Amino acid sequence: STGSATTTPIDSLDDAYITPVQIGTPAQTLNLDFDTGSSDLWVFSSETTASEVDGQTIYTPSKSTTAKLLSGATWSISYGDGSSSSGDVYTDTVSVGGLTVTGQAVESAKKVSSSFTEDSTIDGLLGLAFSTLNTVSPTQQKTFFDNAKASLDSPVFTADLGYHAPGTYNFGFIDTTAYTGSITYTAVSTKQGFWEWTSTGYAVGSGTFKSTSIDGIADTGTTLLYLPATVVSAYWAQVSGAKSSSSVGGYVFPCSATLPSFTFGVGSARIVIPGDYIDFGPISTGSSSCFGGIQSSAGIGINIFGDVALKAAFVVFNGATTPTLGFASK
Numbered sequence: 001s002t003g004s005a006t007t008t009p010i011d012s013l014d015d016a017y018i019t020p021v022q023i024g025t026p027a028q029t030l031n032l033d034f035d036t037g038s039s040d041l042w043v044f045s046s047e048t049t050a051s052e053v054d055g056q057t058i059y060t061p062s063k064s065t066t067a068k069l070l071s072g073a074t075w076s077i078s079y080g081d082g083s084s085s086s087g088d089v090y091t092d093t094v095s096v097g098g099l100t101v102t103g104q105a106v107e108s109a110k111k112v113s114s115s116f117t118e119d120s121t122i123d124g125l126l127g128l129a130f131s132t133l134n135t136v137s138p139t140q141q142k143t144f145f146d147n148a149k150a151s152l153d154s155p156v157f158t159a160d161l162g163y164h165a166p167g168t169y170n171f172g173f174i175d176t177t178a179y180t181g182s183i184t185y186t187a188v189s190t191k192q193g194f195w196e197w198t199s200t201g202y203a204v205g206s207g208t209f210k211s212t213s214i215d216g217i218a219d220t221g222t223t224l225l226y227l228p229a230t231v232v233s234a235y236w237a238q239v240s241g242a243k244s245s246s247s248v249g250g251y252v253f254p255c256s257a258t259l260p261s262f263t264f265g266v267g268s269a270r271i272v273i274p275g276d277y278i279d280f281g282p283i284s285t286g287s288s289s290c291f292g293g294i295q296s297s298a299g300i301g302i303n304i305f306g307d308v309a310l311k312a313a314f315v316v317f318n319g320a321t322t323p324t325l326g327f328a329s330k
Contacts, residue, residue: 001151002172003099007034007161010121013280014307015223017161018121019169022095023106024064030057030123034169035221036159036195036317037304039133039143040077041094042085042107043124044116052112055120059108066102067092075107075135080222080300083115089136094144096126099171101148105134105141125221128157128317133193145171145319155319159220160330161311163277179314179328184269188323192302194219195317197325199305200267202227204235205260209270216303218315218325224280225262225273225308226297235262235294242292248283251292255282262294264309266327273312 007017018031023043030043044053046060061067067090076086087110094104109124116122127134131142149155152172160178161167168178189196194217201211214227232251236242238260242253253259259275278293293308316326 001099001148002153002170003095003097003148004168004170005097006166007169008166009162009164010119012164014161014164014311016122017167017220017307018123019096019126021126023059024061024092025066026064027095028057028059028064030059031121032124032126033122033221034126034128034159035219036128037217037219037221038077038079038125039127039129039131039193040075040107040135041105041124041126041144042075042077042087042109044112045087045108047087048109049111052117054117057123059106059124061090061092061106061108064092067106070105070136070139073105073136073139073141075137077135080304081115083113085109085112085116087111089141096144096171097169099148099152101144104144104147105136107136128220129195130190130193132190145317148172149319157317157319159310159315159317161220161307163274163311167311174316179330181329182269183314183316183326183328184266185316185318185324185326186266188325190323194302195323195325200265202231202265203263203270204238205275207238209263209265211265214264214303216297216305218310218317219304219306220310222304222306223308224304224306225294226300226304226306227294228303229296229298232294232296235260236292244296248289248291250295252283252289253292255288255290257290264305269327271309271313271327271329273309277308277312
């Protein structure tokens with residue numbers, strides 16, 4: 001089997017992407033944030049504290065003839081950005097882009113943190129990291145991909161995120177029309193539960209490539225590119241007037257700037273992030289200070305190849321017995 005679904009930016013900055021997901025019978029379609037950095041499929045629901053729901057579409061398990069309470073199961077998650085959610089668990093039928101999993105754990109939120117409430121466009125998350133990170137207790141649950149894998153034509157999914165435009169998540173096949181040149185594959189460590197890999201270096205603008213190993217995670221659920229402070233300083237040094245602002249929470253730059261590109265290495269291959277992808281716009285409405293899309297990972301504890309990086313590539317998440325990651329230009 002295969003599936004193919006369009007993923008759409010939630011706003012003009014590509015702060016996140018939402019993908020429609022069918023849950024239950026008859027289908028209830030919710031727009032979920034597909035997140036290769038976590039492993040829980042959780043939704044706003046009829047059980048979510050009413051004051052914490054503000055415009056989201058909810059899953060109502062009592063209206064699904066295929067929903068079953070997973071008795072005794074609870075979940076609770078905290079994300080790198082400080083947000084969180086928790087609740088109980090149903091199993092139900094879940095379909096993405098024509099690919100159907102029966103008996104998928106659908107984690108129903110009883111509580112969500114303010115950041116989730118305040119974002120009316122995201123109805124929940126669909127985790128695509130390794131199932132070892134799934135938070136359901138006392139019986140850990142599998143991700144949608146893990147459940148689908150054996151049925152797929154090939155045990156893979158691909159992320160093709162757009163810049164200021166829709167893109168595609170495919171399951172079970174590689175669309176050879178969706179990228180240019182060849183796909184370069186690189187090793188993955190699953191020891192921390194992430195799609196963790198090692199970039200071979202970077203360049204800033206038209207500058208020379210610096211060969212250096214940068215361990216990090218391919219994370220579709222993180223907006224920005226978070227890299228070591230040395231690398232990030234080298235980038236922003238090429239933008240007149242750019243500076244790290246402790247009050248704002250990262251590098252800012254004059255909105256009048258033209259940003260240089262940023263290149264990262266995948267083996268001997270190179271992925272080029274155009275400068276415009278690194279612009280996250282005014283820090284507040286009407287400001288001439290703009291927020292940068294490349295930020296320091298210092299104090300996160302891990303480097304994160306988030307959407308800024310991934311949207312410059314066609315990315316293969318290869319879930320074969322020994323997983324790997326593939327990157328192509330597009």
